[PDB]
Short mmCIF file of C-alpha atoms in Angstrom, two decimals:
data_model
loop_
_atom_site.label_atom_id
_atom_site.label_comp_id
_atom_site.label_asym_id
_atom_site.label_seq_id
_atom_site.Cartn_x
_atom_site.Cartn_y
_atom_site.Cartn_z
CA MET C 1 6.31 26.24 -24.67
CA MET C 2 3.83 23.65 -24.74
CA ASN C 3 4.92 19.79 -24.53
CA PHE C 4 3.14 18.25 -27.75
CA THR C 5 3.95 14.84 -27.11
CA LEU C 6 3.54 14.56 -23.48
CA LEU C 7 0.11 16.34 -23.76
CA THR C 8 -0.81 13.33 -26.82
CA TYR C 9 0.46 10.35 -24.35
CA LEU C 10 -1.59 11.62 -21.60
CA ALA C 11 -4.46 12.35 -23.63
CA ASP C 12 -6.02 8.89 -23.12
CA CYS C 13 -6.25 9.85 -19.46
CA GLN C 14 -5.17 6.68 -18.24
CA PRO C 15 -2.64 6.54 -15.37
CA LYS C 16 1.26 6.79 -16.71
CA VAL C 17 4.38 6.22 -14.23
CA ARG C 18 7.05 8.95 -14.56
CA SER C 19 9.17 6.09 -16.29
CA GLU C 20 7.30 6.01 -19.52
CA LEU C 21 6.79 10.00 -18.59
CA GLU C 22 10.80 10.92 -18.64
CA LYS C 23 10.95 9.91 -22.13
CA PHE C 24 8.54 12.56 -23.33
CA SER C 25 9.54 15.70 -21.50
CA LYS C 26 13.31 16.68 -20.41
CA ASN C 27 12.53 19.17 -17.38
CA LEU C 28 9.29 16.74 -16.32
CA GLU C 29 7.43 18.72 -13.28
CA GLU C 30 8.21 22.13 -15.15
CA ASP C 31 6.45 20.82 -18.14
CA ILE C 32 3.63 19.17 -16.38
CA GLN C 33 2.75 22.74 -14.52
CA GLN C 34 2.97 24.31 -17.84
CA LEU C 35 -0.09 22.49 -18.96
CA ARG C 36 -2.02 23.30 -15.61
CA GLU C 37 -1.44 26.89 -16.25
CA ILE C 38 -3.19 26.23 -20.08
CA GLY C 39 -6.11 25.24 -18.17
CA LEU C 40 -5.13 21.16 -18.29
CA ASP C 41 -5.76 19.37 -15.23
CA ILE C 42 -3.00 16.52 -14.57
CA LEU C 43 -3.54 15.04 -11.29
CA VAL C 44 -0.73 13.15 -9.84
CA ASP C 45 -2.00 10.50 -7.49
CA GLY C 46 0.98 8.90 -5.51
CA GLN C 47 3.18 7.83 -8.45
CA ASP C 48 0.46 7.91 -10.75
CA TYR C 49 0.01 10.40 -13.26
CA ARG C 50 -3.43 10.99 -14.76
CA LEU C 51 -5.29 13.65 -17.48
CA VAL C 52 -8.68 14.53 -16.39
CA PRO C 53 -11.57 15.18 -18.98
CA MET C 54 -14.13 17.38 -18.05
CA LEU C 55 -16.39 15.16 -19.97
CA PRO C 56 -16.56 11.50 -20.69
CA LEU C 57 -14.26 11.01 -23.44
CA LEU C 58 -15.70 10.01 -27.15
CA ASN C 59 -15.99 6.92 -28.67
CA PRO C 60 -15.21 6.86 -32.47
CA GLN C 61 -16.72 3.98 -33.57
CA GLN C 62 -19.94 4.62 -31.98
CA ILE C 63 -19.88 8.52 -33.82
CA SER C 64 -18.43 6.22 -37.30
CA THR C 65 -21.64 3.97 -36.96
CA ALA C 66 -24.10 6.86 -36.28
CA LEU C 67 -23.16 9.25 -38.86
CA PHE C 68 -22.55 6.41 -41.68
CA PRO C 69 -21.48 7.01 -44.58
CA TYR C 70 -19.17 9.93 -43.27
CA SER C 71 -15.69 8.93 -42.37
CA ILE C 72 -14.47 10.42 -39.07
CA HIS C 73 -10.68 10.55 -37.92
CA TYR C 74 -10.53 11.25 -33.92
CA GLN C 75 -7.89 12.79 -32.62
CA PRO C 76 -7.55 13.62 -28.70
CA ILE C 77 -4.80 16.17 -29.37
CA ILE C 78 -4.63 18.21 -32.27
CA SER C 79 -3.12 21.20 -33.55
CA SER C 80 -6.31 22.10 -35.36
CA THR C 81 -9.20 20.22 -37.18
CA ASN C 82 -9.27 22.68 -40.05
CA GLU C 83 -5.70 21.76 -40.79
CA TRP C 84 -6.55 18.19 -40.90
CA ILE C 85 -9.27 18.64 -43.29
CA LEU C 86 -7.13 20.72 -45.57
CA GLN C 87 -3.87 18.22 -45.10
CA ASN C 88 -5.94 15.28 -46.01
CA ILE C 89 -8.03 16.77 -48.57
CA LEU C 90 -7.22 14.18 -51.04
CA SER C 91 -8.37 11.11 -49.40
CA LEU C 92 -11.65 12.74 -48.16
CA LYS C 93 -15.38 12.74 -49.46
CA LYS C 94 -18.44 15.43 -48.36
CA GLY C 95 -18.69 15.51 -44.85
CA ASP C 96 -15.55 13.58 -43.72
CA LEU C 97 -15.02 14.84 -40.37
CA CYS C 98 -12.28 15.28 -37.92
CA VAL C 99 -13.24 15.31 -34.31
CA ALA C 100 -10.98 16.28 -31.37
CA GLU C 101 -10.98 16.46 -27.74
CA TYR C 102 -8.32 19.52 -27.21
CA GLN C 103 -7.17 22.12 -30.30
CA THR C 104 -3.46 23.34 -29.12
CA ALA C 105 -4.20 26.05 -31.42
CA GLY C 106 -6.89 28.42 -31.12
CA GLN C 107 -11.86 30.37 -24.53
CA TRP C 108 -8.32 30.65 -23.04
CA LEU C 109 -8.28 28.12 -20.46
CA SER C 110 -10.20 25.84 -23.00
CA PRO C 111 -10.62 22.52 -21.19
CA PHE C 112 -9.84 19.10 -22.53
CA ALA C 113 -13.11 17.42 -23.52
CA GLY C 114 -15.01 19.98 -22.80
CA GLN C 115 -16.58 21.16 -26.05
CA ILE C 116 -17.91 19.75 -29.11
CA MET C 117 -15.21 19.86 -31.93
CA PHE C 118 -15.11 19.08 -35.21
CA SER C 119 -14.63 20.19 -38.71
CA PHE C 120 -15.59 18.70 -42.09
CA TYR C 121 -15.01 18.71 -45.71
CA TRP C 122 -17.80 20.09 -48.09
CA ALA C 123 -17.67 20.76 -51.94
CA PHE C 124 -20.09 23.32 -53.81
CA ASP C 125 -20.58 23.77 -57.35
CA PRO C 126 -17.69 26.02 -58.63
CA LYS C 127 -19.93 28.37 -60.09
CA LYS C 128 -22.04 28.27 -56.92
CA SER C 129 -22.12 31.19 -54.50
CA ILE C 130 -21.56 30.77 -50.44
CA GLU C 131 -22.63 34.04 -49.44
CA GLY C 132 -24.84 33.37 -46.07
CA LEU C 133 -22.81 29.90 -45.76
CA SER C 134 -22.12 31.23 -42.15
CA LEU C 135 -25.52 31.80 -41.58
CA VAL C 136 -26.85 28.46 -42.57
CA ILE C 137 -23.90 26.64 -40.30
CA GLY C 138 -25.33 29.24 -37.61
CA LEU C 139 -28.82 28.27 -38.08
CA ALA C 140 -28.69 24.61 -38.18
CA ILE C 141 -26.64 24.76 -34.68
CA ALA C 142 -29.06 27.03 -33.26
CA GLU C 143 -32.07 25.10 -34.29
CA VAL C 144 -31.04 21.69 -32.66
CA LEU C 145 -30.32 23.26 -29.27
CA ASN C 146 -33.38 25.61 -29.53
CA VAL C 147 -30.70 28.39 -28.85
CA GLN C 148 -30.45 31.89 -30.47
CA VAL C 149 -28.14 33.20 -33.36
CA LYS C 150 -26.26 36.27 -33.74
CA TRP C 151 -25.16 37.95 -37.03
CA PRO C 152 -22.85 36.78 -38.84
CA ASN C 153 -21.79 33.72 -37.10
CA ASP C 154 -22.33 33.44 -33.05
CA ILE C 155 -24.22 30.93 -31.27
CA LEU C 156 -26.22 32.88 -28.50
CA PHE C 157 -27.77 31.48 -24.95
CA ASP C 158 -28.64 34.41 -22.90
CA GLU C 159 -26.84 36.90 -25.09
CA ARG C 160 -23.98 35.25 -24.22
CA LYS C 161 -21.70 33.17 -26.81
CA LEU C 162 -22.08 29.45 -26.46
CA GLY C 163 -19.80 28.44 -29.68
CA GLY C 164 -17.79 29.21 -32.33
CA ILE C 165 -17.63 29.13 -36.53
CA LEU C 166 -14.61 29.55 -38.81
CA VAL C 167 -15.35 28.75 -42.57
CA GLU C 168 -12.05 28.36 -45.01
CA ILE C 169 -11.74 27.86 -48.32
CA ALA C 170 -8.96 25.06 -49.19
CA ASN C 171 -6.41 26.11 -52.04
CA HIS C 172 -6.99 22.63 -53.86
CA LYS C 173 -7.37 21.92 -57.77
CA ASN C 174 -10.70 20.18 -57.57
CA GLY C 175 -12.63 22.06 -60.06
CA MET C 176 -15.59 22.52 -57.22
CA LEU C 177 -15.57 25.07 -54.25
CA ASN C 178 -13.80 23.35 -51.58
CA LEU C 179 -14.45 24.34 -48.31
CA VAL C 180 -13.34 23.58 -44.66
CA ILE C 181 -16.44 24.47 -41.97
CA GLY C 182 -14.72 24.67 -38.41
CA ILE C 183 -17.21 24.31 -35.32
CA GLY C 184 -16.74 24.55 -31.59
CA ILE C 185 -19.62 24.36 -29.35
CA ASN C 186 -19.03 24.73 -25.34
CA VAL C 187 -20.63 21.72 -23.76
CA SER C 188 -18.90 21.66 -19.79
CA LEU C 189 -16.23 24.79 -19.76
CA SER C 190 -14.20 25.26 -16.61
CA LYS C 191 -15.65 28.55 -15.27
CA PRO C 192 -19.17 35.92 -20.74
CA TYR C 193 -19.56 32.42 -22.26
CA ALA C 194 -22.39 29.88 -22.27
CA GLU C 195 -22.14 25.90 -21.97
CA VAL C 196 -25.19 23.69 -23.34
CA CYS C 197 -24.80 22.05 -19.85
CA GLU C 198 -26.53 24.96 -18.56
CA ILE C 199 -29.31 24.50 -21.09
CA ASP C 200 -29.29 20.51 -20.87
CA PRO C 201 -27.86 19.36 -17.76
CA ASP C 202 -28.19 15.80 -18.92
CA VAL C 203 -26.56 16.41 -22.57
CA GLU C 204 -24.01 13.80 -23.32
CA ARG C 205 -21.75 14.95 -26.22
CA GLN C 206 -21.88 11.59 -28.14
CA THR C 207 -25.62 12.38 -28.74
CA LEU C 208 -25.02 15.90 -29.64
CA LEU C 209 -22.50 15.67 -32.06
CA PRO C 210 -24.18 13.93 -35.04
CA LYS C 211 -27.18 14.89 -34.11
CA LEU C 212 -26.09 18.81 -34.77
CA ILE C 213 -23.56 17.17 -37.89
CA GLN C 214 -26.72 15.56 -39.72
CA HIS C 215 -29.10 18.97 -39.59
CA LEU C 216 -26.14 20.58 -40.41
CA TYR C 217 -25.96 18.68 -43.56
CA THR C 218 -29.40 19.13 -44.76
CA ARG C 219 -29.26 23.01 -44.53
CA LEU C 220 -26.26 22.85 -46.76
CA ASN C 221 -27.87 20.75 -49.11
CA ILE C 222 -30.89 23.16 -48.49
CA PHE C 223 -28.86 26.29 -49.21
CA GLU C 224 -27.41 24.55 -52.20
CA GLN C 225 -31.13 24.30 -54.01
CA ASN C 226 -33.20 27.49 -52.25
CA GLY C 227 -29.92 29.63 -51.31
CA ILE C 228 -30.65 32.85 -48.72
CA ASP C 229 -34.19 32.58 -49.77
CA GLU C 230 -37.41 33.98 -47.84
CA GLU C 231 -37.94 30.94 -45.72
CA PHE C 232 -34.79 31.32 -44.33
CA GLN C 233 -34.41 34.89 -43.87
CA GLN C 234 -37.81 33.80 -41.85
CA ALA C 235 -35.96 31.05 -40.32
CA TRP C 236 -33.20 33.58 -39.37
CA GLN C 237 -35.75 35.86 -37.71
CA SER C 238 -37.34 33.65 -35.56
CA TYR C 239 -34.33 32.55 -33.76
CA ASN C 240 -32.28 35.86 -34.44
CA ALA C 241 -31.34 37.79 -30.94
CA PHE C 242 -30.94 40.99 -32.05
CA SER C 243 -33.58 40.96 -34.64
CA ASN C 244 -35.34 44.75 -34.58
CA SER C 245 -33.00 45.63 -31.81
CA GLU C 246 -30.83 48.87 -31.39
CA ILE C 247 -27.66 48.05 -32.75
CA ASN C 248 -24.11 49.33 -33.52
CA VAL C 249 -22.14 47.80 -36.65
CA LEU C 250 -18.77 48.01 -35.65
CA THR C 251 -16.65 48.84 -38.94
CA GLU C 252 -12.97 50.17 -40.22
CA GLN C 253 -14.68 52.74 -40.80
CA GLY C 254 -15.96 53.43 -37.28
CA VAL C 255 -19.53 52.86 -35.90
CA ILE C 256 -23.07 53.03 -37.37
CA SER C 257 -26.16 52.95 -35.39
CA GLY C 258 -29.42 51.79 -36.46
CA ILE C 259 -31.96 49.34 -35.95
CA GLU C 260 -31.58 45.59 -37.50
CA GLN C 261 -33.88 45.08 -40.41
CA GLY C 262 -32.77 41.13 -41.09
CA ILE C 263 -30.86 39.77 -44.06
CA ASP C 264 -30.96 40.25 -47.71
CA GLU C 265 -30.33 37.29 -50.20
CA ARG C 266 -26.51 37.68 -49.90
CA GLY C 267 -26.65 36.98 -46.30
CA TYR C 268 -25.89 40.52 -45.54
CA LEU C 269 -27.04 42.46 -42.35
CA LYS C 270 -29.80 45.17 -43.04
CA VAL C 271 -29.56 47.77 -40.70
CA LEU C 272 -32.10 50.81 -40.47
CA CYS C 273 -29.86 54.22 -39.69
CA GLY C 274 -31.46 57.24 -40.19
CA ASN C 275 -34.18 57.01 -43.18
CA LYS C 276 -31.82 54.23 -45.44
CA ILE C 277 -30.92 50.52 -45.13
CA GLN C 278 -27.32 50.35 -45.16
CA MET C 279 -26.21 46.45 -45.57
CA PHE C 280 -22.98 44.96 -44.46
CA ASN C 281 -20.54 41.91 -45.30
CA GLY C 282 -19.89 39.81 -42.46
CA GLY C 283 -15.97 39.34 -42.22
CA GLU C 284 -15.86 43.36 -42.32
CA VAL C 285 -18.02 44.59 -39.30
CA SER C 286 -18.86 43.26 -36.21
CA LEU C 287 -22.43 43.19 -34.48
CA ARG C 288 -22.95 44.71 -31.13
CA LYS C 289 -26.05 46.02 -28.79
CA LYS C 290 -26.32 49.59 -28.14
#
């Protein structure tokens, strides 16, 4: 069982003596070791216990001044960035974000401060359709990092997953379509996955996070107008790593083989299997390469 309070107190990544630490944990050394097992690195030098970040910690006010006017909440340790946006939905506007260094619920040995992890609140017209939204989120991320996309919502470098996207619908009666979009991008992971450190060795999470968020909001606004138009489908093809490739579509009824044929106006995957094009929805099916 993870000691959440101990992790939160150690989150500043500054040294803390056991006299204070013994308050948050009862059997302390058993809990420090349990945190070490889940991939966190707590090093005790002499009498000083310190948590080690994989990358330099983020500065909240630097992000806030860079992403004005969007309101930013920074928590070093949180259960879920999506839950905070959901739980505080009544106090937020478009683009308000919850950025964290570690998510306790969610890689397995995921590192503290090794990922760009943020969630944000977005609203659409209640009539509007969100079909293809996860494709817009992925394409924006791929364009910023000059990497590839995989349908429906995978970001790829060297055919390896560089991050993940989670789009959720809030059960709030705003008269609008309320969505929490969650993003995790691997920057430096301790080690079938990829990290931005490979593509850009001198990358800094402080600069990349506003860059990604700004382009993401552009494409979301483009989606509100253009939809999944022909220009978007051309943009998808440019960054698709599975374009016109021999693919296997894993479905609840088994695997359908064929050749990838891009996307339609609803964001559905188009595959040529036999002599007909078969279309699939993202949540129901999974994409792989023969």
